[PDB]
Design a protein around this nucleic acid. Structure first.
Ligand SMILES: [Mg+2]
Ligand SMILES: [Mg+2]
Ligand SMILES: [Mg+2]
Ligand SMILES: [Mg+2]
Ligand SMILES: [Mg+2]
Ligand SMILES: [Mg+2]
Ligand SMILES: [Mg+2]
Ligand SMILES: [Mg+2]
Lengths: 64, 97
RNA sequence: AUAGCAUAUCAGAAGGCACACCCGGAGAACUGAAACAUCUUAGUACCCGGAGGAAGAGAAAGAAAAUUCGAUUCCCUUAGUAGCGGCGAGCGAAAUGGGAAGAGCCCAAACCAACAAGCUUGCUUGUUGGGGUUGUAGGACACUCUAGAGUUACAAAGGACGACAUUAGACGAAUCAUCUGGAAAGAUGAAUCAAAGAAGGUAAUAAUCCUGUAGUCGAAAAUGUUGUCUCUCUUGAGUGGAUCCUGAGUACGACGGAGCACGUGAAAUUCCGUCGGAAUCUGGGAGGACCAUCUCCUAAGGCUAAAUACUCUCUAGUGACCGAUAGUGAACCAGUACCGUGAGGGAAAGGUGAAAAGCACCCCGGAAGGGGAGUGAAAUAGAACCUGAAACCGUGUGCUUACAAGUAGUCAGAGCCCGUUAAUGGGUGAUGGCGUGCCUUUUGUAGAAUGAACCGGCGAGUUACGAUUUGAUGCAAGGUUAAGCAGUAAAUGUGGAGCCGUAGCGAAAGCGAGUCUGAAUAGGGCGUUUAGUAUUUGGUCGUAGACCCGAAACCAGGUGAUCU
RNA sequence: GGGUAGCGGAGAAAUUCCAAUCGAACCUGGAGAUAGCUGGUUCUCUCCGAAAUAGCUUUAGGGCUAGCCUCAAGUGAUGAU
RNA sequence: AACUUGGGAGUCAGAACAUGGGUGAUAAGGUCCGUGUUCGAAAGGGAAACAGCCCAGACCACCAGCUAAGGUCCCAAAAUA
RNA sequence: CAAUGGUAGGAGAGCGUUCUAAGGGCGUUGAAGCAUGAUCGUAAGGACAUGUGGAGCGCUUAGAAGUGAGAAUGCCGGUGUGAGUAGCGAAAGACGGGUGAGAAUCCCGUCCACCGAUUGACUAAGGUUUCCAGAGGAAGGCUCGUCCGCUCUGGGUUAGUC
RNA sequence: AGGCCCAAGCGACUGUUUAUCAAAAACACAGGUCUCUGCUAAACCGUAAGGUGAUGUAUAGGGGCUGACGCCUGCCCGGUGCUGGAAGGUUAAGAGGAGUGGUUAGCUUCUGCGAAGCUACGAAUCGAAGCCCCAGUAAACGGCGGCCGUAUAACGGUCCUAAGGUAGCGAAAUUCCUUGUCGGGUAAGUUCCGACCCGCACGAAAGGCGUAACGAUUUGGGCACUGUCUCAACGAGAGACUCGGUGAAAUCAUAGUACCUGUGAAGAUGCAGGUUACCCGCGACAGGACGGAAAGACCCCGUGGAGCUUUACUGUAGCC
RNA sequence: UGGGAUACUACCCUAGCUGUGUUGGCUUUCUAACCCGCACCACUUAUCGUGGUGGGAGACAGUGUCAGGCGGGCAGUUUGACUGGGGCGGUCGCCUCCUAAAAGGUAACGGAGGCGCUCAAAGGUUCCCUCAGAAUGGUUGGAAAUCAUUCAUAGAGUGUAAAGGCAUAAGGGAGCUUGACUGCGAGACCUACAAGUCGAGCAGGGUCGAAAGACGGACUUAGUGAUCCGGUGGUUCCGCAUGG
């Protein structure tokens, strides 16, 4: 039948123009007293899913 | 699955929502309007007939990339600044509907 | 006076089943989450109760910000989107739009001429019946005014004429000769018919031999079906609007549960149990906590065909479906031998020939057999009967072998027999050299690790849908249809809702070859330099039992105390 | 002659019996349960040709990236001594 | 040769020798690392036989020739040099 | 001029089996199968001739697949080996006569032996025709068999009181 | 058609148990004791109705423990279980609803502020078992120590606890060390009996100690008797063996299947070097073919099962 | 001379005082529901049932909903891995050192130790200053406390483990001070991923210094824990027909 989508993932990544996936960052919910001011604005950004993980999850997000 | 290692898409946080009501329009570029002619009074229906827009999605939006090489009036739903100056430079109005 | 008894009447009920389909009551578990409890399997399986040929649903307290498809259902798309999710596994819409189908209809309530009964006809009761059933707010009311339906809802029965079709059937074109043969339909030559060259028979392969086929015709009867003629039913409007009426232990709230893609929760929408508990148009409900305003609607009574689901049957036909270890378990006296107390479980087994012509007689033998003769094209076609492989068992023999230590071959070679798919040939092999099977599994196996006695047959990555990539082919800033309709179970034509692309950025508002962060005109992220799309071959992946075999086990409904 | 039936019965108690094996009978159905485990997987040639390692893992005889193969594009001296 | 992108994988049980070390007992055909090689996945010659040692990588003939490790009295090709 | 050991594995080219479409063919003057042979190609494999066989089947191109077996203590069916081996299931037989194709094994006779709180007589439960008289000898009887609980034919169960 | 006798455990006895490896010391038992139960009894089967108990009535019925008989059954209520009670605290649903927020009818206009309708919340306060809590209860579940004098498990002191083992018994169906030490029994006694205590780790109804009778019970010793034995021998049959008849099976990769010393996945009919051996049968034996038979009755793994337990988690029939 | 405290106001342990719209409760109490495995009487040849008479009990019990306590009687499950076989013991993430073979990396249930913090100065900056010990020694002299003087290569200090560093002082004072900044970052290091590490420089606004310049924490390296969920403050830019 029609293949489904990892709904848990569709809420975490936006698809970018060259087919990349823009992801949000980790280590950013609490315990900020234990992380530096440098770590915090360099975590206030967006990175791309690394190609190794892309090879792992290509189909979980095929319809995005 | 990652052999019990915490999978990527739980290491990472969700963000954002969906504005259930978006106004996104079928866009027509500047250079896509040089398939019309001079002075000719284009309209959304006319360009739908011409097939430059496969469907009026929530309106028509004119954006500015190329050039006119022409002089004509228009009537669409929304315009960008560049579209406005690019139309008015060669002459011709843009009656927002 | 009631139970209760006692009678009479009535095609009232029971039971069965199609292992299907449908609507309810009740309701698992293995499993998936790589454990498991929420959740999943799943409202599935199994139970029971109703049905009907269909059922459920159905004429708006409905979507929508519309300009309502104006009832219902069902198909395509929306879309694996919105959403729900120990936000994990995984569940998962609806509206809009395009189609199939082309149906709206009745009762309560007010009120009532007249009447049956308590009242004194002042008040009233009634099912007798009328009345009218709806948001443009409908109806009574008061005015004024005027006599088509239908048995599929819309009351509800049944004679009386036709019309095709179906449960027997009828007619139906056109070929002869030779050859080979046991026999031709074959081959060869010469013809013929065709609205018929579908098919099956026939001693071999037949348009012209037979049964048929195309075409045409045909019912005594007993049925479905349908045109009518009857027949049976019967009021249609407007305008005021002062009063009146419009479905109560109901809506709805609280507690506890289920259902709706959405986990007593916002559950508004919606149900069930337990307590409470409303309004009557100057009203009530809905528009996803919600309200105020706007818009839509008018609940708490009922009926309703079509499109839709399925096949125990029957009729006709089809198949890049099986041809007896296949295809049904069952081509054959099969749910039968047989097994079990029983539930149950369950086989093996088709083929002489054209015709039975099924072998008159004779010979040996008690008979079974046989050997002649005869039947037949053939009898190593003789009934266990077409073809008749291998394992296996025999009878002959050409060459070898009785001093030898052998995973049994290879390589080298004398001697001895034979002579072909004639080619630098076939069979055997004194004696020499080298040499511990195969599979699986392993660091490593001759292994004394595992697996196979031997022959034969059967026996494992396929299919559906979707994603990705490569090749191919259309044609390209465009590409493309889906359902449906016509058509032959085809091609194809039509169908442009949708779907992808031509613009991206941001959580979003929004902006746009830019956008986001940011005070920046800084810097930085992602973009911007067009190539996509439809179908399809191949490679993968997802959802399915998804390469095959195989558990210890779990759950539901039944069988069994004849042993113990 | 009868009665008690499997989430049950019966037991002078042995986990003993319940139709020749009872820490929960049998027969069907869910059902092709699940099986990170063992075994099997069937024609031929040609070209190339590994690994038994990291990191993480209720993970240790399993998996996921990475390293090591192969195939096809592209890049074009970047590689080796 | 190398790198980049994309399609397809298998591998996560290693082994012995030589050499640098830990552990053990300057024990083990021990165990854990580093660095080669080989076997694994490698036939051939030598080591009597003998996956890992020495020499050497088998496309297919040939009753041709030269050599490596090992050898040259006989088994058994070559010096009773 | 260079390359060609190879397992997990990747890539490519192919050989074969059934069926279908079309074209072209072969077939009682003998198809498919089966058997033999000293034949051809690099391999999967392809022909040819001769026998049996008594009706279908090749070839070219292209399409589809229930397409290729040697192992799963695989399933079904045949046939081996162990081997002329183990076994022949508690026990007393001998002999004369007869019957027959055939006799330790069947019929008759004599003697002998065993049981005798039973291997005896009844009758229940259960089995259903095994009961009786003729006939037969394939099969069943753990041997043989003229015999039988076997086979064929025809018969046989009688109640007012059991 | 009984062998018998002396002496120890164990169980009182007759009885009953794992059909198909255990018949006993295990189970029953008569007798004790504790506890529950007033009768629609308690307890039990059922969802309920209906039953059992019982057509019984505290000299009756259910359950727990122990288990004839005789002498006895010590100390501890701290903890838990069962009580029974207690006034505070701590307590749910309900009841209660001062107060808080949303919306707007008005008002203000530098945008605040709002009277009630409707809503979203919600609190003092009241609210039952109960749970802390407090005396009893050991034939309830349980528990019955430590240390230092002392020259030694006598006796004192000391710590801790709720209290620290009474009677009887003891190398035991309990004693590791252990064949404890002395005696008896034998020529010789890891076994047996008596005693000692020096109880790893007896002990009083999961009863202590002792008992006549009983037992296909366990364990020593003795007489009798014998092929059990030194030490085997001969007979009688049935198999076995030869002949006639009939005639399987487990097993099986093909087999012309030698020994020694080596090599090797480290125990060779198949490999290397030697040694030995003409071809084919029949009776026999069992060393090997890591013989056959059963996908190890042990062991370890699997995020495999199942049965059982509890102060593991979550829930639950049922009860208050 | 106190202990609260008699203006008013809930209003009293503290008397008195009767009924008022109508009503419950503590509490006795009475019958009509309900109930009786309860006698009699019938239906009726009935130990069932139903209907009547009396007696019992009684608004209780029983029953429905809701809510709390008990609940291995019963049900579904969980109960880690490494490990010279399991078990028992130990261990599990971070930092330092050696093993480690002079880049980097590198294992064992190998050899040694630390961490789950601390500092409003033990931070920034400006200006100053140099130490442990030893003898030539002395009012004390436990010896050496403080003081004196020449050598002292740091033998001392550096908040802490260890190792690299340090007189440029990174060590010790002293004065100002808050850069223990906001927005970022070309570039590199590490590395499977997620993370981790170092950054010149550029804006904004500072503080210190006369200025040049230095400052995005402690000489360097441990002092910790993704993601979902929920809380608090800002900002709305979302918020279903519109406003909120
Ligand atoms: Mg073998
Ligand atoms: Mg062998
Ligand atoms: Mg075998
Ligand atoms: Mg019981
Ligand atoms: Mg048993
Ligand atoms: Mg064996
Ligand atoms: Mg095994
Ligand atoms: Mg066992």
């Amino acid at each position: 039948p029609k293949m489904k989508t990892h709904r848990g993932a569709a809420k975490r990544v936006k698809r970018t123009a060259s087919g990349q996936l823009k992801r949000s960052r980790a280590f950013t919910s609490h315990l900020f007293a234990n992380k530096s001011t440098k770590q915090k604005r360099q975590l206030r950004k967006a990175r791309l899913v690394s190609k190794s993980d892309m090879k792992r999850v290509k189909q979980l997000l095929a319809y995005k | 699955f990652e052999g019990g290692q915490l999978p990527l898409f739980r290491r990472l946080p969700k963000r954002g929502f969906t504005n259930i009501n978006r106004k996104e329009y079928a866009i027509v570029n500047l250079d896509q309007l040089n398939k019309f002619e001079d002075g000719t009074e284009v309209t959304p229906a006319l360009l739908v007939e011409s097939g430059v827009v496969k469907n009026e999605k929530s309106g028509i939006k004119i954006l500015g990339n190329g050039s006119l090489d022409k002089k004509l009036t228009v009537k669409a739903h929304k315009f960008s600044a560049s579209a406005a100056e690019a139309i008015d430079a060669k002459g011709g109005a843009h009656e927002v509907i």
